[PDB]
Symmetry: C3
């Protein structure tokens, strides 16, 4: 089967979309408008549910555009096969709280939003509007075998136990 079951949970939800024909992931739309202060953490609702078949995992991960330009950090979520719940974007405004005020909010383009109302926000605060693409869903196959406890492994590897920068830099 070359089909994925996607369910829209609300009117605020929008169906994921792939950018180019040969692209890896389906861009994820935010279902809610959230303002994030420096160091603030949140799980942004997408109101989108998927039925990933067995033997596959969905990687709910950040986009290079938003991530490189803004301080919004998204933890790559491992969407289990059969997770029929509301996909949540595990997010954090990783900007430092230097404790000085500003009068502008910052959009996902790192640009200061222009508004007629006068407000005092914390510096580094971001606004994410409903319907904006802040994430993407890359679905990769997995290998889930039966685990086996052993005293020692049947063969020696060229790597051995070497890791964490054992080679040069």
């Amino acid at each position: 089967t070359n089909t994925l079951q996607v369910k829209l949970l609300s009117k605020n939800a929008r169906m994921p979309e792939r950018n180019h024909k040969t692209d890896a992931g389906y861009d994820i739309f935010s279902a809610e408008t959230v303002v994030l202060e420096p160091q603030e953490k949140a799980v942004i609702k997408t109101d989108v549910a998927v039925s990933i078949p067995e033997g596959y995992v969905g990687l709910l991960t950040s986009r290079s555009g938003v991530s490189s330009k803004t301080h919004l950090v998204i933890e790559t979520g491992k969407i289990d096969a059969g997770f029929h719940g509301n996909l949540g974007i595990n997010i954090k405004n990783d900007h430092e709280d230097d404790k000085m005020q500003t009068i502008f909010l910052r959009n996902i383009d790192n640009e200061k939003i222009f508004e007629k109302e006068r407000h005092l926000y914390k510096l580094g605060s971001y606004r994410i509007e409903k319907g904006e693409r802040i994430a993407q869903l890359v679905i990769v196959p997995i290998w889930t075998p039966e685990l086996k406890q052993v005293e020692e492994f049947e063969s020696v590897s060229e790597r051995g136990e070497k890791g964490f920068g054992s080679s040069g830099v």
Copy 2:
């Protein structure tokens, strides 16, 4: 073969466990109790070694529960095939050091731990107990081809060189 060789390195080690029948990763137990101050970095030992077969990679990655609730950031580790060493959780308490004291430590549920002894900890400090699931192991297949230097690619793509938010937002 539908079997993975797992070796326990100590009595503090516990064998990885999959939550649901169709889930993606095997939950990783911590083999040591560590207290992490704000901004502090560590590599937490699991005392668990795996023999991943050739053509596959293990993704030693964070769990959504711990990551969304706490300031503990785990870098997704790429466990090479044949790495027979001690799996280390590349971790950081990404909480800001605002330089004010507290009398409670915070567990992996972001709750303040109750204890009879009186101590002064830094605000944002986390305690990770031995035997607690803070990570998971998702094993995905890989494609390792022979690299080839070319003057130019044989075909043009619809994407071209476009990237880093070349589409909208």
Copy 3:
């Protein structure tokens, strides 16, 4: 085909290299020498272009050595199939700006670099030299199906809607 098309864009570019025979990723060399202050963000050029075939994604991701030892955080980039552009390492010096001076820069080994010239740098500043391996490219297969809007999914899963630490910890 067991071949990947790699193009070098400049004399500063170096072709990716795999550490061990059975390793997952090809180590990525930096094409430029960059000094990163605390909290500073950048996209480091590699001057290396790849032609990943359809049905695969490249994961431009951090190395365990550099990541665990330094404050340099690299966001795992999802290199689309047919992205013929300059691979950019989405990086950030996630070290806290505590606003105190130092006279040494810090290399990717977290060691203070010795130099005859006297300068005042910010504490937590890192220097990344041209030709140093700070990243790696792990290529995994993907599953890009045709999406389908449904009122409800055809079957019930044992997981259901449970997530974000629904099991224990």
